[PDB]
């Protein structure tokens, strides 16, 4: 009941309640990740993945 | 009155430092805690 925060290991905020229903929601970052292109030679063709 | 006596602390006196939700971690916190085993005044009522 005393609780209001919540972190992790690593002390980052991983869930939170809910200060208008008294109830827990968790976090997620929301969609980090990495774009890697993927081609072949520019000078064989220009298509791309 | 009441008597002066003394005793151990023990692992007594510990409390949560703040609201941080926190499941199966150790963390290490700086706060004013009782420390372990530190000698507490004991009171009479009569």
Same mark, same amino acid.
């Given at each position: 009941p005393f609780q209001q925060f919540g972190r992790d290991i690593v002390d980052t905020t991983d869930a939170v309640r809910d200060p208008q229903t008294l109830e827990i929601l968790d976090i997620t970052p929301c969609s980090f990740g990495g774009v890697s292109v993927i081609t072949p030679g520019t000078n064989t063709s220009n298509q791309v993945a | 009155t009441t008597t002066q006596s003394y005793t151990n602390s023990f692992?007594?006196?510990? !409390? !949560?430092?703040?609201?941080v939700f926190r499941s199966s971690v150790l963390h290490l916190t700086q706060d004013l805690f009782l420390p372990f085993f530190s000698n507490v005044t004991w009171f009479h009522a009569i």
């Open positions: - | 692992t007594r006196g510990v !409390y !949560y430092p703040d609201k």
